[PDB]
Amino acid sequence: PEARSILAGAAEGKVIATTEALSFWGGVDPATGKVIDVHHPLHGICLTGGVLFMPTSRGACTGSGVLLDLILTGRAPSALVFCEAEDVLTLGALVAAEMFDKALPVIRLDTETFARFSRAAHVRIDQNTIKADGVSLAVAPPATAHLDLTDDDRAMLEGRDGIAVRQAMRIIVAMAAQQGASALVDVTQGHIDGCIYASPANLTFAEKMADMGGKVRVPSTMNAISVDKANWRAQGVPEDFGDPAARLADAYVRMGCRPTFTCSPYLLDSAPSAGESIGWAESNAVIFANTVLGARTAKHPDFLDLCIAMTGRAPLSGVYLEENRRPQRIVDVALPAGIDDAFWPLVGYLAGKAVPDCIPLLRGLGAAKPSRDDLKALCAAFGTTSASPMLHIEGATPEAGLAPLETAETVTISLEDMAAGWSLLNEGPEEVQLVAIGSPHASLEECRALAAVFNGRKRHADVAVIVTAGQQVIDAAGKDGTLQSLKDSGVQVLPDLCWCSISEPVFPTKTRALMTNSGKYAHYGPGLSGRAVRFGSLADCVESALTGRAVSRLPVWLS
Ligand SMILES: O=C(O)[C@H]1NCC[C@H]1O
Ligand code: FES
């Protein structure tokens, strides 16, 4: 029996337990504290005041901002209890303690005690004990850092570079300690993800850092934001939402971040190369950078991305170290005939469910030669159901030859698993009023593939077709004629926004059901939008747009 203090504090309340990880962004509504992940066992439960037992987190880096807002409003759970390593929620609780004077206790239990305490009705937490229904267990004090700090590190910690840089280093050093790191590491560039207006606290944190003089030290790009920056007012986004959403993006631009406003920064000319140590947030971008590009970055939670960008330093832990990039589980993936584009996001989705807390190696798929866009959609879906910052695909990704860990077990993803996943992501009617493409932001190749399927035809007037992409890709599609061909088919191409941050009336209010080819938005979409969401191929979506209807059936490779 072992209880370990991760973050100190005292709490008490009803046990809310689960064996499946939850992403607080997209899975918890900051307005109510209710679970909105329609595929999670806790869907509908309000977590406010409860003691949340779950093995670890999964999915989005933005959970840190959602949790912080929940702590600032009083709708957060009273405590968090894990049984494995965790970063996103712990970081959000650590920011709350460091900068907002709010303590949320976070405890990690051994797996046996986690299950035992999961069945309890009530839990109390104090700084020395955890008791579940009349059995008190001692809580070991937090791990204190065996951290090496350079002279420049200690100068930053001391305030030599101002208070903003100091607060940034304090958070980095606290994170390195809880990750058991023995040093920090230089990063060459950043990618900020907390620029999505996921909660009022996302703005509050950014304006606090910016008001202390925060500024980035390495070149740093920006993820998707919550307004079409140049057009949201003409678009009719309410001033109560669009004004803080625009000020959030403005705060990071003030701090020196490049206004790329895209969740596919690996498509930019500034994309990192193999072996390069970067510090990125946004789950799909982190996984793509490690998996496909071979660059190196942990899955940094929101807020921590800014601190890393401000100091040029990240904790030397996780996938920054070569040994931690070795496969930790083997997944034999069935290879049916007649694969189309929808295969790869489904495979990523199911791989995350099967491997939610370690780095898998997908075997059996190399000869299918997935495209860069296939791998992009795969990593995005994998970054929905798993916490891992990277994966490997045998015969496809550049590090797939690394020796698996001596402890790697072998599991499979069957055709039966795929048929189950397909129906799961297809809980909706056949009528649709919207086709949603571009989560993560569409590449130029994807915009060209979409145009090819449309084949010069125009969408049914009943079915809006919206593509979200980065500004640089839209500019490139404007120059090669792809953009005009899409507008000729009635397709609206939006910059800056993504499906994770879109809102009404840019998201058309008349929508009742939408179809998407994104495994990621298929999962998050129902709880984010309130609409029904269908998942399908690129051509499934286009046929939906041309006819007005998306037929409910398993695809060719599933027959
Ligand atoms: O890391 C993630 O997955 C989240 N960042 C912003 C939106 C969502 O993608
Ligand atoms: S912001 Fe979540 S994938 Fe675009």
Author numbering: 11 to 569
Relevant lines from the article:
Aconitase superfamily members catalyze the homologous isomerization of specific substrates by sequential dehydration and hydration and contain a [4Fe-4S] cluster. However, monomeric and heterodimeric types of function unknown aconitase X (AcnX) have recently been characterized as a cis-3-hydroxy-L-proline dehydratase (AcnXType-I) and mevalonate 5-phosphate dehydratase (AcnXType-II), respectively. We herein elucidated the crystal structures of AcnXType-I from Agrobacterium tumefaciens (AtAcnX) and AcnXType-II from Thermococcus kodakarensis (TkAcnX) without a ligand and in complex with substrates. AtAcnX and TkAcnX contained the [2Fe-2S] and [3Fe-4S] clusters, respectively, conforming to UV and EPR spectroscopy analyses.
Ser70 in AtAcnX may be sequentially homologous to Ser642 in mAcn, which functions as a general base; the purified S70A mutant is almost inactive and brown in color, similar to the wild-type enzyme. Therefore, to obtain a more-detailed understanding of substrate binding, we elucidated the crystal structure of the S70A mutant of AtAcnX in complex with C3LHyp at a resolution of 2.0 Å using a co-crystallizing method; this structure had a similar conformation to that of the wild-type enzyme in the apo-form, with an r.m.s.d. value of 0.4 Å for 559 Cα atoms. This mutant enzyme had the same [2Fe-2S] cluster as the wild-type enzyme, and additional electron density around the [2Fe-2S] cluster was clearly modeled as C3LHyp. The carboxyl group of bound C3LHyp formed hydrogen bond(s) and/or salt bridge(s) with a water molecule (Wat16), the side chains of Ser293 and Lys530, and the main chain nitrogen atoms of Cys71 and Ser293. The nitrogen atom of C3LHyp made a hydrogen bond and/or salt bridge with the side chains of Thr72 and Asp203, respectively. The C3-OH group interacted with the Fe1 atom and side chains of Glu292 and Lys530. The hydrophobic side chains of Trp35 and Ile206 interacted with the C4-C5 backbone of the pyrrolidine ring of C3LHyp, which may explain the extremely poor utilization of 2,3-cis-3,4-cis-3,4-dihydroxy-l-proline (C3LHyp with the additional hydroxyl group on C4) as a substrate. Ser70 was clearly the first candidate as a general base because when the structure of the apo-form of the wild type was superimposed onto that of the holo-form of the S70A mutant, the side chain of Ser70 was close to C2 of C3LHyp (a distance of 2.7 Å). Therefore, we propose that the dehydration reaction begins by the abstraction of a proton from C2 of C3LHyp by the alkoxide form of the Ser70 side chain, similar to mAcn (Ser642). The Fe2 atom, which exists in the [2Fe-2S] cluster in the Fe3+ oxidation state, acts as a Lewis acid that accepts the electron pair from the leaving hydroxyl group on C3.
